Amino acid sequence: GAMAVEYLVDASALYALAAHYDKWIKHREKLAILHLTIYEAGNALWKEARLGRVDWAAASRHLKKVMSSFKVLEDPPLDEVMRVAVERGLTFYDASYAYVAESSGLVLVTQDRELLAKTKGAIDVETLLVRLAAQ
Amino acid sequence: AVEYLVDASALYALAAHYDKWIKHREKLAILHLTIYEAGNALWKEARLGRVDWAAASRHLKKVMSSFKVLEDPPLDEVMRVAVERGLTFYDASYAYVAESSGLVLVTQDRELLAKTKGAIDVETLLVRLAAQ
Amino acid sequence: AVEYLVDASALYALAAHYDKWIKHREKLAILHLTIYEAGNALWKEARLGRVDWAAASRHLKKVMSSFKVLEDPPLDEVMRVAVERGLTFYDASYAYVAESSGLVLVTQDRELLAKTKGAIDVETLLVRLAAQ
Amino acid sequence: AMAVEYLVDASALYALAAHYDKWIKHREKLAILHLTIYEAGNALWKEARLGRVDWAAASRHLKKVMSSFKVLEDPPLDEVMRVAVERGLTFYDASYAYVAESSGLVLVTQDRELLAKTKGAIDVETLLVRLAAQ
Ligand SMILES: [Cl-]
Ligand SMILES: [Cl-]
Structure with a gap:
């Protein structure tokens, strides 16, 4: 099954990436999230709405x-x-992204500083953008 | 065919009566969220200690x-x-999937129970099954 | 004398307009909770990488x-x-203290605004303080 | 410079709340943060949200x-x-660790993490076996 996935993207990353849409499509199919991501992303946006955001x-x-x-x-x-x-x-x-990322031989893309430190191979969103900009 | 959607709070209460419902497992369903919510819940108890x-x-x-x-x-x-x-x-996720899928949401949360069409709590579910 | 009870969300949006309200400072108040709520918010920022x-x-x-x-x-x-x-x-803390104290709750929470008699957002408090 | 010897947090407050007689006699030695009121309050609230007659x-x-x-x-x-x-x-959590460590108090927490990262912190059982020796 098409496993062209290289990065596991969590919510903190997903949020930042949503801004640089153009920059990463085409490169997707290389990007992956967990089912949990959707809910985390959803909850974050819900909080935005709660605190006022027409x-x-x-x-x-x-x-x-x-x-x-x-x-x-x-x-x-x-x-x-x-x-x-x-x-x-x-x-x-967090242990969920750390576990999948490693067990799947994937690069965890995250904004959380503690996850980057406690996950082998993790990088942040700015790094992901320069990597993708290259290939 | 799935009849009920069980949230994290109910999954927990249910894990305490395994035998009374395994025979009805085919009737129960969850959301991917449930695995994480349940997991994070068990994590907190581990955090507050208990070997x-x-x-x-x-x-x-x-x-x-x-x-x-x-x-x-x-x-x-x-x-x-x-x-x-x-x-x-x-909470919305459960209310939505439960309603949109035409299922009975099983939750222990009074708020969700009140705001979801047809929700019932864990005790209610166990008596329904005991009859099915 | 205190006129408004400001919560964490409001507190944040206010820090950027320090100049516009310190004159009315003793008219503003917070709960002990607020100190911890704001600190945690500032902690998550560090957590997500903030020099x-x-x-x-x-x-x-x-x-x-x-x-x-x-x-x-x-x-x-x-x-x-x-x-x-x-x-x-x-949230109910702010709702209760504001109401029971006869104060105007200043919050950015849309939910709180709707369930607290007389609550206003930061934009409003600012135009009032200007009229003052 | 007070009789307060311990800083009790929410997880502790709970454990303790069912051994009331066994420590109320030492109440003057125990202290909490304002945060504790809310944290303990919010906890009870969750029990209520989840059906608690x-x-x-x-x-x-x-x-x-x-x-x-x-x-x-x-x-x-x-x-x-x-x-x-x-x-x-x-x-x-850092709040308890700081107050406790700074004011030279013994932080009583049920949190394994806080215990580990707080100098001289102990759990409820420890506080109870100690107060007993007093
Ligand atoms: Cl942590
Ligand atoms: Cl709520």
């Missing part, structure tokens, strides 16, 4: 479009993630 | 696999429900 | 030192506002 | 229970912020 209705549509651009990966075993979480001092959510 | 997170997680893993997993909802639609009914995005 | 955090936190410290801090609400009363008006405990 | 009576017992704890002043956002960024703690 958008939301329109912003939600945009997110929906960006989201569909990504490939969604199989959920990790609650089993294994729990371990990473416990061992690396991460939350279950 | 067994590994064992406990093993058990949660077992209970989890029993449910069919529905498709993620359109972030679009969920968002409308979240705003229109005063729910979080997560 | 300042140290500097930013020092500015946030000064802005906060400008408000009066009211006594903590009775856990008793807040629970009731929270359950009844479907609000988190933290 | 008596959120009312319960919130009332929690009210009384907490009135016996002295309440220390809020830490300078200043210092907490640094403890957090540095120790991998949230602003909330």
Whole structure:
């Protein structure tokens, strides 16, 4: 099954990437998220709306479009993630990206400074953009 | 054919009565969100200490696999429900999928129970199954 | 005397207009909770990569030192506002204190604005303070 | 410079709240942060959201229970912020760590993480076996 995926993108990244749309499409199919990402992204945008943002209705549509651009990966075993979480001092959510990223031999793209540090191979969104700009 | 959608709060209460419902597993479903919510919940208890997170997680893993997993909802639609009914995005997800899929949402959350067409709590579900 | 109770969301949008309100500072107040709520918000910024955090936190410290801090609400009363008006405990805190104290809640939360008698947003508070 | 020896956080407040008789005699030694009121409040609220027949009576017992704890002043956002960024703690947790460590108090927490990252911190069982020896 087409496994042209190279990066696992979390919500903090997904959010930043949504801004540089043009820059990364075409390069998608190389980008992936977890099922959890969708909800995290959704909740973030909901918070925006809560604190006032006449958008939301329109912003939600945009997110929906960006989201569909990504490939969604199989959920990790609650089993294994729990371990990473416990061992690396991460939350279950973060330990989820850290676990998939590694077990899948993928580069985790994240904005969270602690995840970048506790995940082998992680890079941030600015790095992803320069990488993609190259090829 | 799936009849109920079980959220994280219910999944938890249900994991305490495995035997009373495994025989009805085909009737229960969850959202991919549920795995994470359930997981993060078990993580907090591990955080607040109690030697067994590994064992406990093993058990949660077992209970989890029993449910069919529905498709993620359109972030679009969920968002409308979240705003229109005063729910979080997560809670909204369940209300949306539950209603939109024509299913009975099983939740322990009084708020979701009140704002979702047909929701019932875990005790209600167990008596329904005991009759089915 | 205090006229408004400002929450974390409002507090943030205010820091950028320090000049426009310090004259009315003793007319403004926050809850003890606010200090922690704002700090955590500033922490997530650092968490998501923000070089300042140290500097930013020092500015946030000064802005906060400008408000009066009211006594903590009775856990008793807040629970009731929270359950009844479907609000988190933290949000209900501001709702309760503002109302029971006869103050104007200044929040950016659309949900809070709608469930707190007489609450206004930061834009409004600013035009009022200007008229003052 | 007070009789306060321990800073009790929310997780602790809860554990303790069911051993009331076993420590109320030492109430003067125990303290909390203003944050604690809200954190404990929010916790109880969650039990209520998830169906807890008596959120009312319960919130009332929690009210009384907490009135016996002295309440220390809020830490300078200043210092907490640094403890957090540095120790991998949230602003909330870092607050206890800072107050406790700074005011030379013994932080009583049920959080394994905070215990680990807070100098001389202990759990409820420890506080209870200690108060007993007093
Ligand atoms: Cl953490
Ligand atoms: Cl809510």
